[PDB]
């Protein structure tokens, strides 16, 4: 429509809109950003290098007083879609990422209300480093966190706020290997810094053990059960050495395979 393109031109006019300046009025007031993580799939947990992969929708909401208009003057339009690459954005990133991919994947449009409210919901494939606890494998429960921070503006310029106390599962696809237990979010400050603020989500996940039970534990027990037979084997049959050496071989192989799967680090060794 002619009115819509007139409004889009007027709002983004680079003469009167600089996308590199924070939308703070009254001098040194802060811009409040609401944050909310929605989980779509838990793509994979790779225990070997300690990385969790997720498909999440990162909802961000803030106010930009420079993107206001009067609906009566623009055919009574209440909101418009602006490209998020040409407006000011809070540089909210996954701070504890692995492989160095801080940002979101797509950079969708932003929905702008006439009162200045910005709504942004870009999808992202994230890789986050989380410590793996191997002690109780394959009945282990992991606690992998996602930490979100503005790497440009400190706590004095933008304050992060949680839209909800938990991450959403409204559009989740169940994993099939990992069970979701809890996804609580928390807002953290440093009492000795005063410029630090972040929002962190804990993903408590529980492994479904049937696969590794069937494929690792039962064979291990079967091989271990043969460790004793050598002493009931008569010395005349001439097969004691074959039995005991074969058992030792199988045990060494299973140890090496399990170590490839779930590495024993210093803090804990798998039972």
């Amino acid at each position, epitope marked *: 429509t002619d009115t819509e393109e007139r409004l889009v031109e007027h709002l983004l006019d680079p003469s009167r809109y600089n996308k590199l300046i924070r939308p703070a009025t009254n001098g040194s007031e802060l811009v409040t950003v609401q944050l909310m993580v929605s989980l779509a799939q838990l793509i994979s947990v790779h225990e070997r290098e300690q990385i969790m992969t997720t498909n999440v929708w990162l909802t961000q909401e803030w106010e930009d007083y420079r993107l206001t208009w009067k609906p009566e003057e623009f055919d009574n339009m209440k909101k418009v879609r602006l490209p998020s690459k040409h407006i000011w954005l809070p540089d909210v990133v996954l701070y504890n990422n692995a492989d160095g991919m801080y940002e979101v994947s797509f950079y969708s449009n932003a929905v702008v209300s006439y009162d200045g409210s910005i709504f942004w919901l870009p999808p992202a494939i994230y890789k986050s480093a989380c410590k793996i606890e191997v002690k109780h494998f394959p009945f282990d429960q992991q*606690n992998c966190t996602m930490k979100f921070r503005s790497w440009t503006y400190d706590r004095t310029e933008i304050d992060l706020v949680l839209k*909800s106390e*938990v*991450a959403s*599962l*409204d559009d*989740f696809t*169940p994993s099939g290997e990992w069970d*979701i237990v809890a996804l*609580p979010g928390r807002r953290n400050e440093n009492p000795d810094d005063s410029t630090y603020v972040d929002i962190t989500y804990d993903f408590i996940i529980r492994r479904k053990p049937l696969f590794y039970t069937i494929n690792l534990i039962i064979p291990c027990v079967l091989i271990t059960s043969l460790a004793i037979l050598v002493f009931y084997l008569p010395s005349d049959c001439g097969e004691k050495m074959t039995l005991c050496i074969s058992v030792l071989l199988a045990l060494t192989v299973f140890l090496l395979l399990i170590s490839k799967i779930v590495p024993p680090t210093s803090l804990d060794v798998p039972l």
Partner: antibody
Amino acid sequence: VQLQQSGAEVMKPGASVKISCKGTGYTFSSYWIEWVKQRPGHGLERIGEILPGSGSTNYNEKFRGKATFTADKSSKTAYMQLSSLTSEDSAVYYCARYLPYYYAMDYWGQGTSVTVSS
Amino acid sequence: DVLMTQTPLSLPVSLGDQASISCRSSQSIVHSNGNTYLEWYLQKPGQSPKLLIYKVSNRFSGVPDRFSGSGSGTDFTLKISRVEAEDLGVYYCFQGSHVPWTFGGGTKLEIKR
């Protein structure tokens, strides 16, 4: 927040009853729903739990196979279907919120009394 | 299922008296993170239960300070400093550490006279 349960029921022995717990004012899919049975005599028994977000469900040994949990995401409602009923099933059933290892079960349903008799 | 036993089955105590309820577990219910997930719920007659204490060292919001808790891996107890009329009811101990989670036996509270 608020958890709303269905009304009282009266079913003949051998039938099956489905009672619903509906929650509002919070992210329904991200909280486990705990089902608790209170026989009129005494005691609180946990039937099991369901996470509406996924399909994950848990049951207590005493109730495995006796009850089945299902959840609807479009409408913030969770259902429990009780199998073949007996006179021993007459009790009051509660639904409650829960997030394991964090803030725990601070909101409960009103209660849904169930009566089994011919 | 971890079994939780409460003693005494009843605890008559007049107003202003010290009340002690003990809940014991068939197994250890300590968790790796450092917290132990034990909770105490009060259900007055004709009402749904209420949360009083979670993570015993802690306490819920909106409850009188008189309530308190303590215990170790397998033994836990709840203490009420000053008893009042509104405090009458039944108390249950709930463990949130080992799946499935189970309630306590229930310890009814009376006021003696």
